[PDB]
Amino acid sequence: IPGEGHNLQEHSVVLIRGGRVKDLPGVRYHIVRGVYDAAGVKDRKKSRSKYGTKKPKEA
Amino acid sequence: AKEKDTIRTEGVVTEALPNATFRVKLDSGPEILAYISGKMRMHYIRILPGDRVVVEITPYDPTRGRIVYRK
RNA sequence: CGCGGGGUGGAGCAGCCUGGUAGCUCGUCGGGCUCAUAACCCGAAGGUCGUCGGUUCAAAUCCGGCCCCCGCAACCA
RNA sequence: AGGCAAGGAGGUAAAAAUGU
RNA sequence: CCGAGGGUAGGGCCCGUGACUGGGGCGAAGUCGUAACAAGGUAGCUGUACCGGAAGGUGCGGCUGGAUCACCUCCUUU
RNA sequence: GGCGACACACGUGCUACAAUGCCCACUACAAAGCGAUGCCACCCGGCAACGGGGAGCUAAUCGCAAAAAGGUGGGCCCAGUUCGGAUUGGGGUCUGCAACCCGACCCCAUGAAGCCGGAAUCGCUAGUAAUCGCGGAUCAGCCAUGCCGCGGUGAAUACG
RNA sequence: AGCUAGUUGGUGGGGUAAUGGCCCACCAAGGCGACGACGGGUAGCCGGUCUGAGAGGAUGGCCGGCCACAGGGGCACUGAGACACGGGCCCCACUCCUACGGGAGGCAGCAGUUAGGAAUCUUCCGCAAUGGGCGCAAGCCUGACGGAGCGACGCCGCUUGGAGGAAGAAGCCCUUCGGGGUGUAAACUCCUGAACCCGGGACGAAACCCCCGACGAGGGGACUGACGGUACCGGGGUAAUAGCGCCGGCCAACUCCGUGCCAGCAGCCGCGGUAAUACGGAGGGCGCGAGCGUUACCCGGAUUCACUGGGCGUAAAGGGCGUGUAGGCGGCCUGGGGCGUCCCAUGUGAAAGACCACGGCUCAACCGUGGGGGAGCGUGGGAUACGCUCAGGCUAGACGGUGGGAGAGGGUGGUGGAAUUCCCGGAGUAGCGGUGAAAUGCGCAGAUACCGGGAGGAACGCCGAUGGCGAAGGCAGCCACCUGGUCCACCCGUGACGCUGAGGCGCGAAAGCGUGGGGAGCAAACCGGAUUAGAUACCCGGGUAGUCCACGCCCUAAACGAUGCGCGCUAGGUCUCUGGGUCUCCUGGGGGCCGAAGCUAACGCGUUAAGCGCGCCGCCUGGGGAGUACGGCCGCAAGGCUGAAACUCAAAGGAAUUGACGGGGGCCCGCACAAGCGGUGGAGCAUGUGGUUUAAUUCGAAGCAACGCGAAGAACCUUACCAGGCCUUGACAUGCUAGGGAACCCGGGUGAAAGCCUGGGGUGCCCCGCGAGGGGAGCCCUAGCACAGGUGCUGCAUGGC
Ligand SMILES: [Mg+2]
Ligand SMILES: [Mg+2]
Ligand SMILES: [Mg+2]
Ligand SMILES: [Mg+2]
Ligand SMILES: [Mg+2]
Ligand SMILES: [Mg+2]
Ligand SMILES: [Mg+2]
Ligand SMILES: [Mg+2]
Ligand SMILES: [Mg+2]
Ligand SMILES: [Mg+2]
Ligand SMILES: [Mg+2]
Ligand SMILES: [Mg+2]
Ligand SMILES: [Mg+2]
Ligand SMILES: [Mg+2]
Ligand SMILES: [Mg+2]
Ligand SMILES: [Mg+2]
Ligand SMILES: [Mg+2]
Ligand SMILES: [Mg+2]
Ligand SMILES: [Mg+2]
Ligand SMILES: [Mg+2]
Ligand SMILES: [Mg+2]
Ligand SMILES: [Mg+2]
Ligand SMILES: [Mg+2]
Ligand SMILES: [Mg+2]
Ligand SMILES: [Mg+2]
Ligand SMILES: [Mg+2]
Ligand SMILES: [Mg+2]
Ligand SMILES: [Mg+2]
Ligand SMILES: [Mg+2]
Ligand SMILES: [Mg+2]
Ligand SMILES: [Mg+2]
Ligand SMILES: [Mg+2]
Ligand SMILES: [Mg+2]
Ligand SMILES: [Mg+2]
Ligand SMILES: [Mg+2]
Ligand SMILES: [Mg+2]
Ligand SMILES: [Mg+2]
Ligand SMILES: [Mg+2]
Ligand SMILES: [Mg+2]
Ligand SMILES: [Mg+2]
Ligand SMILES: [Mg+2]
Ligand SMILES: [Mg+2]
Ligand SMILES: [Mg+2]
Ligand SMILES: [Mg+2]
Ligand SMILES: [Mg+2]
Ligand SMILES: [Mg+2]
Ligand SMILES: [Mg+2]
Ligand SMILES: [Mg+2]
Ligand SMILES: [Mg+2]
Ligand SMILES: [Mg+2]
Ligand SMILES: [Mg+2]
Ligand SMILES: [Mg+2]
Ligand SMILES: [Mg+2]
Ligand SMILES: [Mg+2]
Ligand SMILES: [Mg+2]
Ligand SMILES: [Mg+2]
Ligand SMILES: [Mg+2]
């Protein structure tokens, strides 16, 4: 799971994009936040798309 | 967000384990797998079994901690 | 109850037997040595030889009894 | 007799674990 | 008659699970030793064998991807 | 008030454990440095620390200051003692506002351990170690046996 | 790794539109196979599509062609044609009705439901076009098709304005406080005028039909739109959506705050543990733009499976060698065949695409038209250099003859001494052996050491080599036998007979195992002793298998030159051994060393190449997993061959280089040890420290290079620590707002002092006024401020030292 901190519990539907993480063992997969139970990275404001964050409203 | 819902609880080091990971017997219940904080590594502050150390525990999985305090 | 052997620095054991003159190893503590730990080395600390007696100028030692500890038998009833 | 060197002797080079 | 298929016994193959076990990789501060890299403190390495907590050890042979080819004393000739 | 606490351990030094010494008395040679509210000649009081009086210098010109070990004479005679000096009691002296914690000094009494030290270890190649005093700086005073400095006596042995 | 029984062929028949094992009866016993059969997996195939410099590699969506299938299987029937997608029959799977006897089903047609799933469309209109079927025709049908709808899914096109407009508004951000950035960007002026409204509005559609003409040609006429009232034209008419990724290197773009190996990022290196150009955010940038990124998958880059184009001594990689089958390759001449090979012609290679030209939709996508190419393949002619093949010949390759030679080549039978042990005999006595020291061990039944003999078994000293032999493993006393290989010399004989070698067959050290023997030493295991923390070990004393032989089997190895074999070329020298010569020098064949050219990553190789080539084989494509699993084979077993993957790591490695290091070497040094004198540690005390205790024992220093150190002077001071009293712009610095008093001195209370509260002398300076009085300088007090202060935390932020 990437981002800034997830909201995922246990019996929750998640979607996977793969792509090796270098550090971790057995884990070749990123969860794609922004779909199903993995709701978007709240407070995220820069690189949105990768994280599933809806547009924040300007002035 | 930078989340400080972190528990800063004391624990007498129980188990000498590999890679400067030490199961430490908390007074917040059992002995979780708690690993050394990087500062300690930098300063070469040695942990042996039997040290009452503050161990940083996130609610997400308390299984793993962090030896925050130098004994 | 009968017989043999032994009881000793904290533990194991030498010395007794052949009168005088108590040692080593492990353990205790301190030091050294080492950059440091063990290892090491050193010491230092520490026994009247189970105990009561007697022997003899003098007993761990010669001798008795008790106290133990080990074992072997304990038969005819 | 010394001079060098080749070879053969034999004596010597003891032992001493680890990692902030 | 031939005949899709079914049934009876046998096998093969794969998939699922599988008690049971082999069990491998990496990991800073786990434990016992210290095998290897320097003649690594008995050269190593190698095949094989037997044995041991474990590295391994030793035997038999092989190799150089092996260092050292010293320093006094004697004999034998230059 | 604390840095000086003290069941302990270590490092660095001093002073020892004696007679190549110790004590007493006389006697003899240094260098280098300092000294102004600083050093203090000399005189008396005091057992003394010092106190008081007081010359001198502004320092090659006075003062600290006696150098000590040494040399002569006396004692001590192998003992824990005339070795040794710690501790502890008492009286004092000085500095300073004040020394109880926590000063130095004098005097008297006290006279502990220690009879040359286990493994280990450190210095030193010549005027050197060993031992003997003196000066200083900081500093009111000093816990200085430290440091820094100066001379006196004066070695050993290096095959390798 | 073998497969096959209608299976391979035959004869006759049937069946078929037709050949045929399609089927059947009978006979034959073949057929296929490593040029890879059968078996398993995989998968419609292709024109193409994507990539690619190309060769290639993958892919086979749409579009076109072919196949195959219509729930799964099996079967026919009818017909020109099916084994029949919306036809039939049957069994089964499944859903549906059922009055339980039986029936009906099949969207892999369009659309839609449902499931699965990351994910994929409207239960659309139309017969207008084009095509299909039927029909004389009208027409009828047509989810073929033509269009529209939904989706940035893809490609392509356009808009989100343009023109001016500051030495630079604000807003935000940074700053060295000046300034810079955003940015002419904005606002504002001017113009245009998507959207949007109204007016018109198609090309696509002229046939089929009717009539003249004979129902022929030809001629006239008519109807005929789902798109769509769309496209498009004419007028009007508004400044009118910007996003997304990145920002350390690759890679284009940099700063600050927040965070502190945390949260986090990551495609790799990696970044984060307090000044992050890598994280979060902000500004700024930079990339693209109605998209942009992520992920998957394919190619590329990967010349990283290499034909173009990599290699193999040490990096992964040469097989252990030999012989040899298939296979591959092959000297020189002459001639023919003409299969390869080339060429020309020509047939093909459908259309679509790709490529060029032009045209059409306002451009372009998209489409149209024309052309060219196109590897391959067939057919006819040609060419013979090269390969093939046939014939003849040659002697350079290769093989043989004869004359010799060297040799630890191999096997079989023997013998010859030293030595060992063991036995007897002798003489002889107090230890031997062993070690870094020792102990176990043997020895008084007399060892050991010495001589005499005998018994064995094993190995072969010196020569002996840096040497010789073999293909390798290997091989040494000597002799005999049998017997291989090889080398030369003559150039005499043969006339290319060769080189290589998947497999196969054979050998194959050492250990091992089986059967039988033999057994001296040595000597795994084992039993002892020491050594040691421990000792399964190094060291010693034994000691069993084994070493030795026969026969059998095992077949591995650093089976090494870590260099596959074969030939040709490409400086030498130097030493060696072995042959011939016209023999202080030539010329062969081996063994080494140095080095030309060249090669190589360097080391090194260098006529014994790793040089230049050619031939063929073996193998390699990151390390670990692992020579392991799994199968298969082989083996009496041990094990061997044959040999993965899953996962995991961003390395495993080679060669060198600089250093460092070595219980590696040589050369050196120093009070480093020795040689010597005096201590330290033991004693007390002086001190400093650690520890401990404290309210605090201030803080640091840490092996040498912390420990009579900072401290060259702690009673208070010092002083940094603690307890108490107290102070606040404050002990000290430069100022401000400013308000009064302000130079100055002397007290008094309280108090441990500091401080606090407080009296009272005390204002002169510049000066204006007659005076009352007024303001400002010095100097000081009060309240807020800017600040002071900190021995407070960091010497891995630093300067100095
Ligand atoms: Mg945490
Ligand atoms: Mg080793
Ligand atoms: Mg026929
Ligand atoms: Mg057939
Ligand atoms: Mg198949
Ligand atoms: Mg398929
Ligand atoms: Mg292809
Ligand atoms: Mg069917
Ligand atoms: Mg028919
Ligand atoms: Mg059908
Ligand atoms: Mg049909
Ligand atoms: Mg069909
Ligand atoms: Mg459908
Ligand atoms: Mg659904
Ligand atoms: Mg679903
Ligand atoms: Mg469609
Ligand atoms: Mg309709
Ligand atoms: Mg009709
Ligand atoms: Mg209909
Ligand atoms: Mg269509
Ligand atoms: Mg503009
Ligand atoms: Mg206008
Ligand atoms: Mg209109
Ligand atoms: Mg850049
Ligand atoms: Mg990012
Ligand atoms: Mg790296
Ligand atoms: Mg990045
Ligand atoms: Mg950032
Ligand atoms: Mg995209
Ligand atoms: Mg290697
Ligand atoms: Mg051959
Ligand atoms: Mg052949
Ligand atoms: Mg050929
Ligand atoms: Mg030829
Ligand atoms: Mg074409
Ligand atoms: Mg065309
Ligand atoms: Mg055009
Ligand atoms: Mg011929
Ligand atoms: Mg010949
Ligand atoms: Mg011959
Ligand atoms: Mg005899
Ligand atoms: Mg001839
Ligand atoms: Mg002839
Ligand atoms: Mg033996
Ligand atoms: Mg032993
Ligand atoms: Mg043993
Ligand atoms: Mg042995
Ligand atoms: Mg055997
Ligand atoms: Mg090999
Ligand atoms: Mg071969
Ligand atoms: Mg040879
Ligand atoms: Mg030669
Ligand atoms: Mg060259
Ligand atoms: Mg060479
Ligand atoms: Mg090469
Ligand atoms: Mg193997
Ligand atoms: Mg197997």
From Swiss-Prot, chain A:
Family according to the record: Belongs to the universal ribosomal protein uS12 family.
Residues that bear 3-methylthioaspartic acid: 23
Post-translational modification note: The methythiolated Asp-23 contacts a modifed residue of the 16S rRNA close to the decoding center, and might be important for decoding center assembly.
Native source species: Thermus thermophilus (strain ATCC 27634 / DSM 579 / HB8)
Bias (Basic residues): 43-54
Region listing for Disordered, in residue ranges: 40-59
Superkingdom in the source lineage: Bacteria
Oligomer and partners: Part of the 30S ribosomal subunit. Contacts proteins S8 and S17. Interacts with IF1 in the 30S initiation complex.
Name of the protein in question: Small ribosomal subunit protein uS12
UniProt function note: With S4 and S5 plays an important role in translational accuracy.
From Swiss-Prot, chain B:
PROSITE patterns: S1_IF1_TYPE
Entry's family note: Belongs to the IF-1 family.
GO cellular component, one term: cytosol
Main location: cytoplasm
Domain of life: Bacteria
Subcellular location: Cytoplasm
Subunit structure: Binds to the 30S ribosomal subunit, contacting protein S12 and the 16S rRNA. Component of the 30S ribosomal translation pre-initiation complex which assembles on the 30S ribosome in the order IF-2 and IF-3, IF-1 and N-formylmethionyl-tRNA(fMet); mRNA recruitment can occur at any time during PIC assembly.
Domain S1-like: 1-71
Purpose: One of the essential components for the initiation of protein synthesis. Binds in the vicinity of the A-site. Stabilizes the binding of IF-2 and IF-3 on the 30S subunit to which N-formylmethionyl-tRNA(fMet) subsequently binds. Helps modulate mRNA selection, yielding the 30S pre-initiation complex (PIC). Upon addition of the 50S ribosomal subunit IF-1, IF-2 and IF-3 are released leaving the mature 70S translation initiation complex.
Ranges in a coiled coil: none
A GO molecular-function descriptor: rRNA binding
Organism of origin: Thermus thermophilus (strain ATCC 27634 / DSM 579 / HB8)
This protein's name: Translation initiation factor IF-1
Keywords linked to the UniProt accession: Cytoplasm, Initiation factor, Protein biosynthesis, RNA-binding, rRNA-binding
